[PDB]
């Protein structure tokens, strides 16, 4: 039982951590860049209006 559980725990830990890192990174960069573009657009809009 110990062997089975150890093997499966290690495998799931590894795969989950790697996949999460990989995919959340691209997601979060998309999000941050969209936010930054919005911020830049707001700055431009305010300066243009002024």
């Amino acid at each position: 039982a110990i062997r089975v559980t150890q093997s499966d725990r290690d495998l799931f830990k590894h795969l989950i951590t790697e996949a999460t890192s990989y995919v959340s990174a691209d997601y979060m960069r998309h999000a941050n860049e969209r936010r930054t573009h919005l911020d830049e657009a707001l700055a431009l809009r305010g300066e243009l209006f002024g």
Partner: peptide, 20 residues
């Protein structure tokens, strides 16, 4: 808790892409 990881909000595309 898996795909969104908001603690990462404070870095740029370069680092995120490299680590990805």
């Amino acid at each position: 808790r898996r795909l969104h990881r908001r603690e990462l909000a404070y870095m740029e595309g370069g680092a995120l892409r490299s680590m990805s």
